[PDB]
Structures are given as structure tokens and as C-alpha cells.
Write a protein that binds this ligand. Structure first.
Ligand SMILES: Cn1nc(-c2cccc(CNC(=O)c3cc(Br)ccc3O)c2)cc1C(=O)O
Ligand SMILES: [Zn+2]
Length: 351
């Protein structure tokens, strides 16, 4: 009973892969900012998080909204957990040449995020005009730090991130519970990769970012090493993630006039999806023939998290994404009812 879901997926895939000049405009704008930022005193080591991440799309229904991350390496960094929040940190410096590039943003021993953004934004804001109609926005703030608009259609969220090649902070030690699915060998390898810090609040605090580990898992997602390398070992994991993402997006669109869904994002959906991967580690539990059932397991688990108001961060297990101080009871109950409506009516949002 997959026929409608496949067609949704087919429609979505054709609009992703269709010939477009968007990635080209985005890349020339970004190479522009990278040259300009590289000449400034604080941003001399700035670089793209991934060569080829010009075409990173958070919104899976909008192929002209691009998501771009700029990375800056902070060697010998001192993290201090903020207010037992497990996920938010002050950045301090071990300062060996106490005039490290970032020192001009120090207030006390503490790295200021808002000051760093002000100059990042100001450098970008002036570099914007000296080709194309690149407009920016001081909207929202935080992360995304800067949203550019190329012409009318194309939109580029730029996020600035600190990179640390030391071992991941102690709040991750019992997370990424992939041992029964991707193996303990692979968990070790992943935790040997650097971690990233972006600004956000719940003061001058930073938050862990793991989009690179997510990408890595999704590009090597099977218990079997040959998963999805032919169509005989073809699994529906990635397609379920797509259908989860698209369902929230269409509900966020349908109900934008109200407000109850403003706090949910694809991060809540990704997180719940990887928990289901842990719960179902076998590739035979993700057979393409069973797309319909497999999607339904994801939708069932997410609804269970909403109803119990528990969805543990996949990397930091003491952090509850659905805690009532983060999203109130009336918002989860609202999203609970819309998803149950969709499931019981063979998903009208997919039309
Ligand atoms: C509302 N909100 N809160 C966060 C957030 C808060 C604390 C800690 C992390 C840690 N990060 C992850 O758990 C993570 C997981 C996956 Br899977 C992929 C990338 C990731 O960074 C994220 C992100 C968003 C949002 O984006 O709206
Ligand atoms: Zn697969």
C-alpha cells in the first residue's frame, strides 16, 4: 500500500534534480563572501563546512531555499555548560597567544556570540553590493545568522559555526546509540570527527551542531555494508525521512495563519527518525516493498513522543526536545491531532 507515497516521492525527486541555475548564483555569492571574510582580522580562517554544501536544502519542498554553513576553527577551546541545560555552553579561551583572532569579541573570559555576528553581518552587508540583486535581512537573528535573497526566488541562510577538533563534550558521552545498528566501530569513528558550535538561547551561549554526522549516517545507513548499492538490497530509510519532513512542512504551511507549529522543525523529525532506526536496526525492517508500513512506524513513534512529551536529543540524551518549557502542551496536542487526521484520511497534504 505504497502507491500514493511513491508518487509523492517521485514528484519531490523530479523537482530536486531538475536543471536549475540556482546553485550557480549561490556559489558565486558565497565565494565572494569567503574572499572578503578571509581578509578580515577575525575571520581569516573561515571556510565552507563542505565543498559542495552550496546546495544544502533544509526545506525539502522548496528547492530555491539554500542552507549554507561557514566554519571557523577554534583551537584549545574551553566550554562551560550553561545552567545544567546539557546542550548550551559558554565558550572560554585557553589563550596561548591571548591575541587569538577572536579575542576582539571577548567580554571577560567569555566569547560573545552577538558581537561576532554583528561584524560577520556587517562585513557581509557591505560586501553585498560590490552582478546580481543580493538583498539581506536582519530578521530573527541567531541561527540562521544572515539570510540573503538572490534575485526574487533564491534564498540563502548563512550560519556561522565554531569548529573544535577536541573530543565531543561530556554531555554527548552516552548519545549516538548506533552500536546495534551501524556498529560500535562506526560510533568510535564518528566521535573522532570534530564538533561544531552555533549561537542560540533557551545570554551569550553556543549550541552543539551535528549536521555533518547526520549527513554521514544517511550516506551510509545500513546494518549491511552494501545497503542501497543495488536494488536487491534496496531500503526505504531515506524515503521515510523525506516523508516525515514533507508532512511537517505541509502542516507548517497549512497552519501558518495560526501559531501552534512555529516551534517544530525538521530537527524534531530527524531526531525521532533516527530513534526509529535504532529501534529497528535490521535492513530487512526497511524493505522498499514495505514503504507504507515503515513510514507508518515513523509516524506512530513521533505521535507517541508528542503524547508523552518526550523526544530525547539523539546526541545528548538528557535533553528533551518536547519538554514543556520548550514547546507547551497545547502545541504538541495540536500537532498530535493534525497528524492523526492525516493518517486516518490517507494523507491529504500529499496532493
Ligand atoms: C529548535 N532546535 N533546537 C536545536 C538544538 C538544540 C539543542 C541541541 C541541538 C543539537 N543538535 C542535534 O541534535 C542535531 C541532530 C541532528 Br539528527 C542533526 C543536526 C543536529 O545539530 C539542537 C536545533 C533546532 C532547530 O534546528 O530548529
Ligand atoms: Zn539503504
Amino acid at each position: 500500500g505504497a502507491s500514493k507515497l511513491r508518487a509523492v516521492l517521485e514528484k519531490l525527486k523530479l523537482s530536486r534534480d531538475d536543471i536549475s541555475t540556482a546553485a550557480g548564483m549561490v556559489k558565486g555569492v558565497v565565494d565572494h563572501l569567503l574572499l572578503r571574510l578571509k581578509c578580515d582580522s577575525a575571520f581569516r580562517g573561515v571556510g565552507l563546512l563542505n565543498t559542495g554544501s552550496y546546495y544544502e536544502h533544509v526545506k525539502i519542498s522548496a528547492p530555491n531555499e539554500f542552507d549554507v554553513m561557514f566554519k571557523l576553527e577554534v583551537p584549545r577551546i574551553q566550554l562551560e555548560e550553561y545552567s545544567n541545560t546539557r546542550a548550551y555552553y559558554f565558550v572560554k579561551f585557553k589563550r596561548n597567544p591571548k591575541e587569538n583572532p577572536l579575542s576582539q569579541f571577548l567580554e571577560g573570559e567569555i566569547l560573545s556570540a552577538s558581537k561576532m555576528l554583528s561584524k560577520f553581518r556587517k562585513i557581509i552587508k557591505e560586501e553585498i553590493n560590490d552582478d546580481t540583486d543580493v538583498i539581506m535581512k536582519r530578521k530573527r537573528g541567531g541561527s540562521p545568522a544572515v539570510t540573503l535573497l538572490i534575485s526574487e526566488k533564491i534564498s540563502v541562510d548563512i550560519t556561522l559555526a565554531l569548529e573544535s577538533k577536541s573530543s565531543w563534550p561530556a554531555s554527548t558521552q552516552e548519545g549516538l546509540r548506533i552500536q546495534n545498528w551501524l556498529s560500535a566501530k562506526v560510533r568510535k569513528q564518528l566521535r573522532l570527527k570534530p564538533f561544531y558550535l552555533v549561537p542560540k538561547h533557551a545570554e551569550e551561549t553556543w549550541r552543539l551542531s551535528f549536521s555533518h554526522i547526520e549527513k554521514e549516517i544517511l550516506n551510509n545507513h545500513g546494518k549491511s555494508k552494501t545497503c542501497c548499492e543495488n536494488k536487491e538490497e534496496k531500503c526505504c530509510r531515506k524515503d521515510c525521512l523525506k516523508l516525515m519532513k514533507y508532512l511537517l512542512e505541509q502542516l507548517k504551511e497549512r497552519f501558518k495563519d495560526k501559531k501552534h507549529l512555529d516551534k517544530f522543525s525538521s530537527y524534531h523529525v530527524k531526531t525521532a527518525f533516527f530513534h526509529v532506526c535504532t529501534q529497528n536496526p535490521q535492513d530487512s525492517q526497511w524493505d522498499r516493498k514495505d514503504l507504507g508500513l515503515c513510514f507508518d512506524n515513523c509516524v506512530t513513534y513521533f505521535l507517541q513522543c508528542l503524547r508523552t512529551e518526550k523526544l530525547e536529543n539523539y546526541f545528548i540524551p538528557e535533553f528533551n526536545l518536547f519538554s514543556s518549557n520548550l514547546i507547551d502542551k497545547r502545541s504538541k496536542e495540536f500537532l498530535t491531532k493534525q497528524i492523526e487526521y492525516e493518517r486516518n484520511n490517507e494523507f491529504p497534504v500529499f496532493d
